Amino acid sequence: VCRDWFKETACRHAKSLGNCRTSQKYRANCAKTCELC
């Protein structure tokens, strides 16, 4: 099952910063912050 992976906030950073889908972990590993799940 997909989902974030670092702290649920490490992800929210990448969701409101630019890496939501431009960074790998930050998009998939933090797919809960950008809905990339």
Coordinates of N, CA, C and O in Angstrom, one line a residue:
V1 N 0.9 -1.2 0.0 CA 0.0 0.0 0.0 C 0.9 1.2 0.0 O 1.9 1.3 0.7
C2 N 0.6 2.2 -0.8 CA 1.4 3.5 -0.9 C 1.0 4.3 0.4 O 0.2 4.0 1.1
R3 N 1.7 5.5 0.5 CA 1.5 6.4 1.6 C 2.7 7.2 1.9 O 3.8 7.0 1.2
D4 N 2.7 8.1 2.8 CA 3.9 9.0 3.0 C 5.0 8.0 3.5 O 4.8 6.8 3.6
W5 N 6.1 8.5 4.0 CA 7.2 7.6 4.5 C 8.0 8.3 5.5 O 8.5 7.7 6.5
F6 N 8.3 9.6 5.3 CA 9.1 10.2 6.3 C 8.1 10.7 7.4 O 7.2 9.9 7.7
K7 N 8.2 11.8 8.0 CA 7.2 12.2 9.0 C 6.1 12.7 8.1 O 6.3 13.3 7.1
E8 N 4.8 12.5 8.5 CA 3.7 13.0 7.6 C 3.9 14.5 7.3 O 3.4 15.0 6.4
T9 N 4.8 15.2 8.0 CA 5.0 16.6 7.7 C 6.1 16.8 6.7 O 6.1 17.7 5.9
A10 N 7.1 15.9 6.8 CA 8.3 16.0 5.8 C 7.6 16.1 4.4 O 8.0 16.9 3.5
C11 N 6.6 15.3 4.3 CA 5.8 15.3 3.1 C 5.0 16.6 2.8 O 5.2 17.2 1.8
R12 N 4.2 17.0 3.7 CA 3.5 18.3 3.5 C 4.4 19.4 3.1 O 4.1 20.4 2.5
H13 N 5.7 19.3 3.5 CA 6.6 20.3 3.0 C 6.7 20.2 1.5 O 6.5 21.1 0.8
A14 N 7.0 19.0 1.1 CA 7.1 18.8 -0.4 C 5.8 19.0 -1.1 O 5.7 19.2 -2.3
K15 N 4.7 19.0 -0.4 CA 3.4 19.2 -1.1 C 3.2 20.7 -1.3 O 2.9 21.2 -2.4
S16 N 3.5 21.5 -0.3 CA 3.4 23.0 -0.5 C 4.7 23.7 -0.9 O 4.9 24.9 -0.9
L17 N 5.7 22.9 -1.2 CA 7.0 23.6 -1.6 C 7.3 23.4 -3.1 O 7.8 24.3 -3.7
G18 N 7.1 22.3 -3.7 CA 7.4 22.2 -5.2 C 7.8 20.8 -5.5 O 7.7 20.4 -6.7
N19 N 8.3 20.1 -4.6 CA 8.8 18.7 -4.8 C 7.6 17.7 -4.8 O 7.9 16.6 -5.0
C20 N 6.4 18.2 -4.5 CA 5.3 17.3 -4.4 C 5.4 16.2 -5.5 O 5.3 15.0 -5.2
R21 N 5.8 16.6 -6.7 CA 6.0 15.6 -7.8 C 7.3 15.8 -8.5 O 7.6 15.1 -9.5
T22 N 8.1 16.7 -8.0 CA 9.4 16.9 -8.7 C 10.5 16.2 -7.9 O 11.6 16.1 -8.4
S23 N 10.2 15.6 -6.8 CA 11.2 14.9 -6.0 C 10.7 13.5 -5.9 O 9.5 13.3 -5.9
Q24 N 11.6 12.5 -5.9 CA 11.1 11.1 -5.8 C 10.5 10.7 -4.4 O 9.3 10.5 -4.3
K25 N 11.3 10.6 -3.4 CA 10.6 10.2 -2.1 C 9.5 11.2 -1.8 O 8.4 10.9 -1.4
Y26 N 9.9 12.5 -1.9 CA 9.0 13.6 -1.6 C 7.6 13.5 -2.4 O 6.6 14.1 -2.0
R27 N 7.6 12.8 -3.5 CA 6.3 12.7 -4.2 C 5.6 11.3 -3.8 O 4.5 11.3 -3.4
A28 N 6.3 10.2 -4.0 CA 5.8 8.9 -3.6 C 5.9 8.7 -2.1 O 4.9 8.5 -1.4
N29 N 7.1 8.9 -1.6 CA 7.3 8.7 -0.1 C 6.5 9.8 0.7 O 6.3 9.7 1.9
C30 N 6.0 10.7 0.0 CA 5.2 11.8 0.6 C 4.0 12.1 -0.3 O 3.5 13.2 -0.5
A31 N 3.5 11.0 -0.8 CA 2.3 10.9 -1.7 C 1.0 11.1 -0.9 O 0.0 11.3 -1.4
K32 N 1.1 11.2 0.4 CA -0.1 11.4 1.3 C -0.3 12.9 1.3 O -1.3 13.5 1.6
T33 N 0.8 13.7 1.1 CA 0.8 15.1 1.2 C 0.5 15.7 -0.2 O 0.0 16.8 -0.3
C34 N 0.7 14.9 -1.2 CA 0.3 15.4 -2.6 C -0.7 14.5 -3.2 O -1.1 14.7 -4.3
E35 N -1.1 13.5 -2.5 CA -2.1 12.5 -3.1 C -1.6 11.7 -4.3 O -2.3 11.3 -5.2
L36 N -0.3 11.5 -4.2 CA 0.4 10.7 -5.2 C 0.2 9.2 -4.9 O 0.7 8.4 -5.6
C37 N -0.5 8.9 -3.8 CA -0.7 7.5 -3.4 C -1.3 6.8 -4.6 O -0.9 5.6 -4.8

